[PDB]
Amino acid sequence: MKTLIIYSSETGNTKMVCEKAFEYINGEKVIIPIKEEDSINLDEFDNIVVGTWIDKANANAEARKFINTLSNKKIFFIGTLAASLESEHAKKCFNNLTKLCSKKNNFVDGVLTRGKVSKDLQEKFTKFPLNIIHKFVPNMKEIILEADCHPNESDFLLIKGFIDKNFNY
Ligand code: HEM
Ligand SMILES: Cc1cc2nc3c(=O)[nH]c(=O)nc-3n(C[C@H](O)[C@H](O)[C@H](O)COP(=O)(O)O)c2cc1C
């Protein structure tokens, strides 16, 4: 059995948790960024685990496009987002990723972990249009601040549980 972990990451959060997933998996496995897809033959992999960061409650474009090149693959996701993992927003994100993976592939499971908001985006949040767009989103300031320390051990434990559940202990 061969497992591929293939990910998008701009500021490293998704890469970080996907690297933990790679470490925890036993047996044959490869981890690459999506940009290096040509380094492997997708046909050789029984499990495809896609790492994605949340962009407006959905998979980031690079990861969305990659998933939409796949058909009938046994597929999983590992997502990062800045919202609280207990929030309704996170549940909406999880459902959106489930819908994306299940549409044309064979979706088994996924996990969301938390990741800090980039310095650049934290600055843009104080400017038009993001400040107006999120004006009435509750707890906006604290959500961003409480994401700053993530990913951290709490997220790695979520990854460990996800790998335990789906691949091996
Ligand atoms: C460039 C970055 C972002 C953009 C362009 C963006 C865009 C939007 C837009 C347009 C909406 C209104 C709903 C819609 O029309 O789709 C929205 C709502 C919301 N955004 Fe963002 N957002 C960004 C970053 C973030 C981040 C970093 C967080 C969390 C830390 C966040 C959390 C939310 C929440 C909780 C809502 C309320 C609606 C919901 O629960 O989905 N957003 N955002
Ligand atoms: C353009 C953009 C849109 C984002 N939209 C959301 C969002 O809708 N919900 C959320 O919780 N986090 C959102 N975030 C925060 C990222 O999902 C989070 O910081 C992620 O861990 C970054 O991953 P990376 O470091 O692998 O690039 C957004 C970030 C960016 C840059």
Task: Output the keywords.
169 residues, alpha/beta, Rossmann fold, six-stranded mixed beta sheet, 7 helices, 40% helix, binds protoporphyrin IX containing FE, binds flavin mononucleotide, Flavodoxin/NO_synth, menaquinone-dependent protoporphyrinogen oxidase activity, nucleotide-binding
Describe this protein's structure.
The PDB classes it as flavoprotein. This protein is an alpha/beta fold and 169 residues long. It has helices at 13-24, 61-67, 88-104, 119-124, 130-133, 140-147, 153-166; strands spanning 2-7, 28-33, 47-55, 58-59, 74-81, 106-114. It has one domain: Flavodoxin domain (Rossmann fold, 3-Layer(aba) Sandwich), CATH 3.40.50.360. The chain has seven helices and six strands; from the N terminus they run βαβββαβαβαααα. Strands 1, 2, 3, 4, 5 and 6 form a six-stranded mixed beta sheet that branches. The longest helix is centred in the middle third of the chain and has 17 residues, at 88-104. The radius of gyration is 16 Å and the shape is globular. It starts with a strand and ends with a helix. Protoporphyrin IX containing FE (HEM) is lined by residues 56-57, 82-83, 89, 92, 117, 121, 130, 133-134, 137, 143-144.
Number of separate domains: 1
CATH superfamily: Flavodoxin domain
Helix content bin? 40-55%
Assign the CATH topology.
Answer: Rossmann fold
Q: In the CATH classification, which architecture applies?
A: 3-Layer(aba) Sandwich
Identify every distinct bound molecule in the structure, by name, code or SMILES: protoporphyrin IX containing FE, flavin mononucleotide
The biggest sheet, with number of strands, parallel, antiparallel or mixed sense and barrel status, is: 6 strands, mixed
Query: Between the first and last Cα atoms, what is the distance in angstroms?
Result: 15 Å
Strand runs, count: 6
* SSE order, one letter for each helix or strand: EHEEEHEHEHHHH
β-strand percent reads 15-25%
PDB class: flavoprotein
Keywords: FMN-containing flavodoxin, heme acquisition chaperone
Assembly: monomeric
Entry title: Heme-bound flavodoxin FldH from Fusobacterium nucleatum
